[PDB]
Amino acid sequence: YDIQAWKKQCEELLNLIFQCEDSEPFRQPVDLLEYPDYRDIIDTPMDFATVRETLEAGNYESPMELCKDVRLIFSNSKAYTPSKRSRIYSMSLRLSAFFEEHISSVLSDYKSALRFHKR
Numbered sequence: 001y002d003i004q005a006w007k008k009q010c011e012e013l014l015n016l017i018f019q020c021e022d023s024e025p026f027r028q029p030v031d032l033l034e035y036p037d038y039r040d041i042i043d044t045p046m047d048f049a050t051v052r053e054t055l056e057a058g059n060y061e062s063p064m065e066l067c068k069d070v071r072l073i074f075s076n077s078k079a080y081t082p083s084k085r086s087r088i089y090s091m092s093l094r095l096s097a098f099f100e101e102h103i104s105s106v107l108s109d110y111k112s113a114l115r116f117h118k119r
């Protein structure tokens with residue numbers, strides 16, 4: 001029932017994601033010199049350094065907000081991919097499965113703790 005525990009749990013999950021080779025294309029913002037048309041297709045760029053910085057600045061109120069931004073990294077990759085078989089998109093699918101597998105208990109514990117708080 002710790003309402004604040006999600007934050008360190010998310011920091012540890014981001015550290016694991018940064019250690020994972022599949023996160024390398026997603027660790028920093030989109031390079032517009034490499035992908036000049038990126039902003040023609042993607043309205044809201046997102047990356048893991050921006051997620052980590054938002055968390056460390058105290059700018060996420062809940063793990064659901066962090067989860068929305070991490071999911072945006074993966075949906076941007078899916079929207080920008082020229083093929084469902086591309087290398088970078090394939091890395092995003094594995095990383096998404098790893099993220100979802102680990103974030104589930106973080107969301108569940110936070111939501112349970114908040115329901116207990118408001119009981």
Ligand SMILES: O=C(C1CC1)N1CCN(c2ccc(F)cc2)CC1
Pocket residue numbers: 025026028029030031032034035038076077078080081082083086087088089
């Ligand atoms: O510029 C970058 C990274 C160097 C920072 N990105 C924009 C293009 N993204 C992308 C996604 C799926 C795809 F299949 C191809 C590209 C990957 C991340």
